[PDB]
Structure 1
Amino acid sequence: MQPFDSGHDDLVHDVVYDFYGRHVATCSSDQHIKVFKLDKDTSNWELSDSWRAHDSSIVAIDWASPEYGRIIASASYDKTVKLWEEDPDQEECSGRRWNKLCTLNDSKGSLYSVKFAPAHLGLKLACLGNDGILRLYDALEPSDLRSWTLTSEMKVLSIPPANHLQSDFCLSWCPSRFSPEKLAVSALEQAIIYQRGKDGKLHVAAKLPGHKSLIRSISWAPSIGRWYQLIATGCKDGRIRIFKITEKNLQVELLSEHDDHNGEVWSVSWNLTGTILSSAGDDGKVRLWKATYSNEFKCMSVITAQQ
């Protein structure tokens, strides 16, 4: 294990595993995405490649599933998502193995997020920007990664994001296609669950209540152990709120709500087996939560690090 320096010269905005979790990509204000492949031997992330994937700061990076090959979408403040495919037989340690699939000039504002749809719901990506426009992109084919059509736009935030409305804003999908297609979107205090109608225009299907403060992360749980959903939110007041959404249109219920960071919970991140939530928040400590047989999540462990 042990401390390692990523070698980024500016700050790390994101850490994203592959869907198989064989790669970690980090993105920074130094215009690079650095992609590391997992050496199990040292249990460290060893530098595979580094390239400028935009001519500005990279603030959202996300992996698509290695089930169509490795695709990178990356969001920058230069107004474009740039799409990249990994070739092994292209050179590594040079940035010659990421061939640009496209440049999408379909984003009229500067991006702050781009996030892939799970394998199970089809290859789609959502955008959000600093013009406050939720963008729904559908690839025309799962094997044609070089075009993506804007299929829907929904004006989320009441006031656009500006130099003081600037916060973490997050895009998360619904991993189940045995649940109607949706994507929960957190912007400020409101988390609004959007659902695809049968008319091919997105509608508001639900609103998540009980958000007393800004949502700094929203993460939709894969429905595993049960076929219902759970969405966790990390909020600024040290609250982990796990609400359960049952499918009967959507019902809203609480599962549990508890607060233990007590400063601000910055990130919520569910595992892919949808049974362990790990949250971190202000105070520098990571709390690892596992369900009881009273059917509620409780803190099983506390890891303390640096600030």
Structure 2
Amino acid sequence: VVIANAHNELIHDAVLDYYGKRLATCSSDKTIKIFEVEGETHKLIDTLTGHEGPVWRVDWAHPKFGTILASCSYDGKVLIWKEENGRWSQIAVHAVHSASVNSVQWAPHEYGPLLLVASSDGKVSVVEFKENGTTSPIIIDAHAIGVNSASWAPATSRKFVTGGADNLVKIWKYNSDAQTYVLESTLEGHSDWVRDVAWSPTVLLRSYLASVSQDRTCIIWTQDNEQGPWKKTLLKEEKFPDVLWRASWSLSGNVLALSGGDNKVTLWKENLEGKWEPA
């Protein structure tokens, strides 16, 4: 199934929603597009407008809140969108960062309608939408140089991993006696900017993290339990041909989808040894 020419400017993100039927894209044209794919057909449904700069990413929210989509852009702001009564409209706007926002992600539906945001300004913001609408977020300084990604850990006590341009990967946990997310662990292992970080939703004892970097390597970080440390495990002994840009875990099977710069997508799974191989 292919939807050629969804945009005329280069596209940076395409995400299907909770039912994996409703597509959504974003690119330099500074717009988002909603699609409806079936067998091998497709129908545009709208074009979201507002961002003053190329749009970097989008994330669909859990259906239990409505039909929402979040986006962020080089313009250093985040826009939420809604499809009420049959038409999309900018409900809220989040802009507390002073540089390009590169990632945005809806927390687990159990936490409510929270949003995880990371920016080149080095900070990360956590945002909920009050009873009235406005937003009173959490802002933390999380990386030097710039933050490129941030992902939520599955639900139990709330944790999320960030990936900065300081080559570091970082786990965060919420604390009461601070009313903020505090730095739980710093994981060193990349020699160049970390482009993305994905926390696997696998519900097994062991937790899985996958970080991708400008150094042409993918690292799977794992933690057996609370007393265990985060163990480093290169996805493969040899570096890759080009820069790895994204990492995505399936919802089941704990299968990793790696997006390279040689515009190639490799798939991996774990084996008896604890080493990865092509799935």
The interval holding the TM-score normalised by the smaller chain is 0.7 to 0.9
Residue type matched to 2:118 in 1?
L
Deviates more, 1:285-294 or 1:20-29: 285-294
Residue type matched to 2:81 in 1?
W
Structure 1 gaps of 5+ residues are 91-96, 162-167, 301-307
Report the CA distance between 1:219 and its aligned residue: 0.7
Alignment match, 1:99? 89
Deviates more, 1:246-255 or 1:276-285: 246-255
TM-score by length of 2: 0.88
Q: Secondary structure at the match of 1:17?
A: coil
CA distance in structure 1 between the partners assigned to 2:205 and 2:134 by the alignment: 33
- Structure with a larger share of its residues in strand: 1
Alignment match, 1:170? 149
2:199/2:209 contact within 8 Å kept:
yes
Cα 1:184/1:5, change in 2 over 3 Å: same
CA distance in structure 2 between the partners assigned to 1:155 and 1:201 by the alignment: 11
Find 2:169's aligned residue among 191, 201, 207.
191
Alignment match, 1:305? none
The yes-or-no answer on 1:266 pairing with 2:253 is: no
Q: Secondary structure at the match of 1:158?
A: coil
Q: What is the number of equivalent residue pairs in this alignment?
A: 276
Please give the per-residue CA displacement for 1:142-182, whole angstroms capped at 9, x wherever unaligned: xx6x33321x22212334x5xxxxxx81121112x21x211
Structure 2 gaps of 5+ residues are none
1:172/1:218 contact within 8 Å kept:
yes
1:185/1:191 contact within 8 Å kept:
yes
Report the CA distance between 1:255 and its aligned residue: 4.8
Report the CA distance between 1:274 and its aligned residue: 4.7
Alignment match, 1:38? 37
Q: Secondary structure at the match of 1:147?
A: coil
Find 2:139's aligned residue among 153, 158, 163.
153
What is the percent sequence identity of the aligned residues?
27
Cα 1:122/1:174, change in 2 over 3 Å: farther
CA distance in structure 1 between the partners assigned to 2:176 and 2:225 by the alignment: 18
Please give the per-residue CA displacement for 1:26-60, whole angstroms capped at 9, x wherever unaligned: 10111210011221x22x44312113143432222
Cα 1:263/1:30, change in 2 over 3 Å: closer
Report the CA distance between 1:294 and its aligned residue: 3.0
Alignment match, 1:208? 187
CA distance in structure 1 between the partners assigned to 2:130 and 2:97 by the alignment: 18
